[PDB]
Ligand binder design. Structure first.
Ligand SMILES: CCCN(CCC)C[C@@H]1CCCCN1CCNC(=O)N1c2ccccc2C(=O)Nc2cccnc21
Length: 381
């Protein structure tokens, strides 16, 4: 009845997903291989990840669409086991790749003196190569030759699944060792990445990125309530940052406190200028505010926190994987003891959620980066 338009919707949306995934990860790979500034170790890891996501976008998405649309596996047992081995090797390589990224960042933050000089491109490529090789050797022979190990192929004609995952014990231990334990590891690692990068001026200097981002908000405002809110928040950041001693430690130091003494005054001038709705006038006043700021940046401020945004990106990738892959693993755990508890619709949701992770990774690391955006504009134009 209604399932015809449902099928058309399925092939359209699925094809769109696959195409967007292919375009995104291909753009990442070409951008890294072309731009020399994108040839750092972080982008080596992101290159391996983009490769896995491209493999998922080219094969697994279209093969799963074929399975759901046709209602059974129409290609054959050889192709079925090839696709099972491929999906498993690629997922395991994804987990190990994310672990490599997490440990790399953790060592970069916890050993700032000894570790950075050891980070070379040869070590990065050697470790990602070891990751793919380990995943392949672990999963491929079992999935491809278990039928010959037991002397029988129990997979029915038209279906596609793994025989040795019939025992709930191997599914549970595999779920613990392959997903949950690595996720806990990544959580602790990122937690120490955040705690170790937290102390001193940075915590207190966050007020400065606060008045900066609020300045940018003032630039793109539309009414007096927006510049009022951002302006008061700027006043809070300036007042907390005023009684904050900079690292360079009265003569030429009353300069530092005098700069905030004038800054809060200009924030008051623009705030009373905003209480009656002079929006653009308050914005220009905020520009002169940015001039005074500029003076005191170039006078008494340490270098910016480029590594902190890197931590933000790491969190983006890890949260992408964890959030997108949690439902499927939960469905596996529940399926170990209650099969009718998980309908086929929600199974489909889990599958497409992992694949969607492969779709959204480039937006996590590449679309928020200035260099990747420059290379993208260069490649598309
Ligand atoms: C049964 C395979 C179905 N698959 C189709 C293959 C043709 C689609 C699936 C789901 C969408 C993504 C593609 N595959 C996933 C294959 N992976 C898989 O299962 N598991 C994983 C394997 C390695 C690393 C992590 C996991 C893991 O996260 N959980 C886990 C826990 C316990 C048992 N197996 C898995």
């Amino acid at each position: 009845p209604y399932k015809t338009f449902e099928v058309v919707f399925i092939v359209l949306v699925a094809g769109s997903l696959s195409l967007v995934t292919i375009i995104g990860n291909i753009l990442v790979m070409v951008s890294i291989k072309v731009n020399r500034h994108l040839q750092t170790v972080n982008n080596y890891f992101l290159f391996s990840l983009a490769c896995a996501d491209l493999i998922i976008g080219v094969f697994s998405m279209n093969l799963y669409t074929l399975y759901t649309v046709i209602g059974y596996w129409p290609l054959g047992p050889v192709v079925c086991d090839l696709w099972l081995a491929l999906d498993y090797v690629v997922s395991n390589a994804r987990v190990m790749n994310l672990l490599i990224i997490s440990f790399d960042r953790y060592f970069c933050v916890t050993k700032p003196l000894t570790y950075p000089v050891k980070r070379t491109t040869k070590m990065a490529g050697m470790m990602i190569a070891a990751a793919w090789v380990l995943s392949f050797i672990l999963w491929a022979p079992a999935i491809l030759f278990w039928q010959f190990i037991v002397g029988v192929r129990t997979v029915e004609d038209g279906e596609c699944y793994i025989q040795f995952f019939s025992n709930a014990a191997v599914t549970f231990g595999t779920a613990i060792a392959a997903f949950y334990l690595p996720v806990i590891i990544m959580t602790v690692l990122y937690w120490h990445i955040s705690r170790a990068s937290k102390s001193r001026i940075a915590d207190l200097e966050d007020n400065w990125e606060t008045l900066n981002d609020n300045l940018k908000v003032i630039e793109k405002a539309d009414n007096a309530a927006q510049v009022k809110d951002a302006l008061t928040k700027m006043r809070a950041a300036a007042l907390d940052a005023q009684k904050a001693t900079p690292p360079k430690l009265s003569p030429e130091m009353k300069d530092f406190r005098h700069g905030f003494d004038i800054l809060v005054g200009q924030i008051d001038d623009a705030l009373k200028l905003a209480n009656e709705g002079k929006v653009k006038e308050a914005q220009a006043a905020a520009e002169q505010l940015k001039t005074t700021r500029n003076a005191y940046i170039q006078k008494y401020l340490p270098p910016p926190s480029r590594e902190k945004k890197v931590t933000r990106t790491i969190l983006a990738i890890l949260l992408a994987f964890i959030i997108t892959w949690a439902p499927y693993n939960v469905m596996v755990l529940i399926n170990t003891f209650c099969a009718p508890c998980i309908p086929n619709t929600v199974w489909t949701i889990g599958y497409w959620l992992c694949y969607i992770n492969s779709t959204i990774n480039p937006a996590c690391y590449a679309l928020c980066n200035a260099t990747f955006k420059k290379t993208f504009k260069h490649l598309l134009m």
